């Protein structure tokens, strides 16, 4: 190997695995206190699923949805129920690959700048997915 | 978003695309003087592709060829040539999914770690394919 | 193996093949009484394909039309004639993977809740789709 | 939906998500004892990912890795350590969809039936990899 | 192998492949004639295509669009401009894997019922691609 | 739809729906008696499904993998455990798209000409699957 | 190799590898002067890539994004932004496989005829991105 | 549209599609000459399928097959039978994505360039498959 160096390098930032896990499991637990059946992915802002935690009970679709959620959110640095909204004026956006534009999603920041989404699907609307997203991101 | 903070957050080190381009075209360069039609592939050790050149008069089989020797080689932090003889005693290697056993990827690091891995495919032989991707390294 | 014990372990329910098998084999008799083709598919909760049963002369199209909505079914627990109207007020449902807003599946229960979707497909309408989809549960 | 019952019903046993989890957590506790870097999967026997893990620096290649051999392990309940010998007298088995023949994958049973598999990549040897699954396993 | 008899088998109708070549020339030399650049796909009621031809000049979109319109012609027995209209009253037909609901694609019948589908992509507009296809299906 | 004839047509035999499902269900039988859990296909010489069966406690990995017996008898009409012995002087037939070179396949032919394969997977050892797979098709 | 002569051959006309990096290279430096993090990409009219660049801080959507923006463009000779307009009277189109129908794709001529497109993904709005693809292309 | 000029452009040469298609239909004759049954494939230097044709009778896996065996020959400028035999020297030829090295496949040139390879499969063996490949290229 070439070493590089260093007007060549740049950095980014990231959830560890620590604070990805932490929050999934959070988002689960507050879906679980409800009695509800979710499925939850942590999403880097590199496009990599850094986390995913299939919920007892929860439907066979949810995994890869909560995976498209997060990646969405971090994508665009948004919640996905925002980010349906956008569809009435961009309806395209929805045919970008590796997406999904319905509530769940929500984003997490550091500096500023998005670094992860975590996604949640599974219970009865999105909004209610959204919520327990939101109660994963709020242990961050 | 919630913002992230702090013992919650990593870094990573990257080449930035100015980086990964002019090593992309450093490669191609050293193929073209020789005669040679070749595509090149910067992939980060995030596992995303930086950087693809689909060489004039490149076999169609060289583009996804590159960049799965450029991703092989940053996973393992190895040239793909060494790699391939690892085959040997472990044969299975080869079926780990996005992978290319097959001389022509080189890794890239920074601070001993792996950051890139530069592939080409194209050239008459993976040991000439591995001189020019070992050019585009060179000028990091 | 490590074996799990005790508070480790979790029960699901099923239907077993023999009652999937009956089911789909009622669904294309009901079909065949009326002179339809049509494929079907019985999709077990946890995502799997439990038994598919091609009709004769059944369009090419109708085979995995047949699977999404037995998949769709099952992960929301209603039929897809029902599930399709909620794309009214969540039109993002349906970009979900795997899954198919047709009328057409409709889900099969155990202990209140769902262990098995039947879809049917390839008649002139999703409504029949589902008559035939319905005359297949109905035997269990 | 029709209810099924009863001699139509059969149960299957799997791991909760807190025990996936667990398991899951300690393969990368161990792993980072000893400054390893690795992907962690839980596969169930049904063959559904319950929980995937990303650790830190882990390379690109190691998730999908992971999945594969934990989903391996549960397949035919045997550590894919072993299953890998097996290749010299059916090489042709690894050509079955979704399995990666290669250490690092171990099986976890309950009355005697695997449940899950637990499937480790991104240390320097799959016997490595296996050594941290196993101490995954071993917290169940 | 064991011979199947006899009430076990029966009998489907399709063009022999120079029937569906004569056809995709017809429908090249009608668009050629015209100064237009198409692909053209034949597929059988079967669902696998029996013919391609790539246009010079014919845009890279072409070619799969040409099968897929091909393909949804023959599973519904109707021209896909008209197959497109249904769309109003059942919006989710599209939706259905390996379909295209655009002009172009134009069903052969043999016994009334229906045996191949040829697509026509390329063109400025469907409805003269379905004037190309027709002019391949008028050589039958 | 333009009527073709007639000269410009062929025919095909296939095992009904009826032949199949009777086939598919001898050879679950068949392993069922003997306390195996296999998955078992039957796909028509025209490379599609008919029929799929997933026995109860039959391996994840065991569906796909009797699909694509089924498909590489039928292909060749002669039985995978063969198939898989011309590997020794053509080992690169297993690189054909769709195939699977493993004990466990068995054609059904109809005047001498391939019209079915029967798969089964799940058993342990590929010449069990294949005792089964005979079993499937000695009812026809 | 027999030798094909000469009625038998046609010419079609590409952007060189170094006229679609000048191009890609200058997308990415107007998003950088106004501080736009974005992804370009270069697909020739036979519908290959031929440059892609990943911008320092992209969002994981935008390779993709540009990739097919590009195709698009090149596929109908004209800027995705006023494809997307179509979509209005022809709402299937976008079902066309490899299309993404939304503003940032512009195409690039010679002699009259298609001969690449450049796409860029990115930014805050498709209009934006489409500013850098028309800033790249004015370099040619 | 930019118009691209001048030096920024270069030309590569292709077969026509009329002569992609008597070569194709040359090989297909030849097989029917034998009582063979074969699927034929011409594919561009630039990757792209051009032309092809399923026999009557031809094996379900016989289609991909010449494709990618069409794929190979062009990619290296030599007939596939040629090729597998570097396998013995370079074993991980045959990851490259889109290749069959299996014989069949032979190219054809313009300038003692390679332009197309013709890739046939069906026939009961792969020497037999590339004599009709050669057959349908010595027409050019
Ligand atoms: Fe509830
Ligand atoms: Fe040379
Ligand atoms: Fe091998
Ligand atoms: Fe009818
Ligand atoms: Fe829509
Ligand atoms: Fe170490
Ligand atoms: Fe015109
Ligand atoms: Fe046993
Ligand atoms: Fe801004
Ligand atoms: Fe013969």
């Known amino acids: ?49 850094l986390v995913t935690l299939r919920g007892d009970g929860a439907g066979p679709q949810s995994y890869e949805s909560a995976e498209r959620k997060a990646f969405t959110a971090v994508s665009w640095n948004a919640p996905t129920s925002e980010l349906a909204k956008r569809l009435a004026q961009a309806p395209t956006l929805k045919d970008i690959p590796g997406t999904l534009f319905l509530a769940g999603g929500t984003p997490v920041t550091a500096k500023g700048a998005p670094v992860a989404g975590i996604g949640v699907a599974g219970a009865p609307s999105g909004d209610l997915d959204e919520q327990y997203a939101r109660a994963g991101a709020a242990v961050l």
Chains 1, 2, 3, 4, 5, 6, 7, 8 share one sequence.
């Open 1 to 49: 190997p070439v070493a590089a160096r260093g007007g060549e390098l740049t950095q980014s930032t990231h959830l560890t695995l620590e604070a990805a896990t932490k929050a999934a499991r959070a988002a689960v637990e507050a879906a679980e206190k409800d009695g509800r059946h979710v499925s939850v992915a942590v999403v880097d802002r590199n496009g990599n699923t």
